[PDB]
Amino acid sequence: VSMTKTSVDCTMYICGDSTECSNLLLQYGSFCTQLNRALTGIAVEQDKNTQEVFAQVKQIYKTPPIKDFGGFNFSQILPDPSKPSKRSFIEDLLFNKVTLADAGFIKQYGDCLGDIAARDLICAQKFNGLTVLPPLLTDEMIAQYTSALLAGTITSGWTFGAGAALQIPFAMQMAYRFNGIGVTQNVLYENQKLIANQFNSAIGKIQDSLSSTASALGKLQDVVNQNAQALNTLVKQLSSNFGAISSVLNDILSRLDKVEAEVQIDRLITGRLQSLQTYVTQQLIRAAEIRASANLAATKMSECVLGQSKRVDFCGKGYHLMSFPQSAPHGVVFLHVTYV
């Protein structure tokens, strides 16, 4: 649904702490502004994508405290009030299978210097002007929108999308969902114990799968890995000569005068500037992949969660009954209930 919000101090990347190089860089003109504007355009829309996907209710529906849902046991996908962030049990699995790097959330040098400067790639990124911003909605705010969508779905059915939320008993909603798939509504009421036990068993297999395999959220870890590899490649491009006597800007200015250095520093500006251009081109192309995924996820939210979908194999393989959203790091997870 989204990706890390980078912002790059283009003068500190190309010309870290130098006046001579900053006065040379000005001769390329608008480029460092054009890069920061372009990266700001990507960073601004990660909050658009996350808002379009999750903020499909302007009303935070709360479940009843009693769970008279006719045998269906949503305790596995509803919030856990005991936790410091009020996310559900299946969300606390999803939030552990994807291993984020730098959520934007404050650095105070004591951790960026000394024992933690060494191994930590994130301090090397930062010390060369590469900065990652926080998302607008916290992981707690995403869990509150997901909680509203789920508490709406189970208590209200599709009715909370089309207008004001109208309560309906859950086994009475499932009779509407069965008429939706062309099955007669008595095929629920005459089998309701079996249908509840099969749902509860199927959510038991979601808990077991996510608790067992090391690879299920691969579509999300591959986004974190692409962002982290792109920032690491952008960092390594600072170590290249581009044909200058050294990669190191101070090793030129402590060895060469006000006219020999201009011939060297302009090489490093040319190659460093192409390295930022290549990064922002990749990140703009990438951001269109994540946008297309977020516009799909907002459509699966609109049509599988706030509704029931007569579109074949859109909301999982089978005749679609309903879906439950679950949040994940930089993404969304749908639990698609299907009659097979």
Binding site: L166, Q167, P169
Partner: protein, 40 residues
């Protein structure tokens, strides 16, 4: 007396849905609404 304020953003009006295993809400009336949507 105007100033810039900073706050944790509200997500929406809170609503506990009046659910029961035998209670249904049905609309006795409707509103026809027209909403503009703009696409490049």
């Amino acid at each position: 007396s105007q100033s810039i304020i900073a706050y944790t953003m509200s997500l929406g009006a809170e609503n506990s849905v009046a659910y029961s295993n035998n209670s249904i809400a049905i609309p006795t009336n409707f509103t026809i609404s027209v909403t503009t949507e703009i696409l490049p």
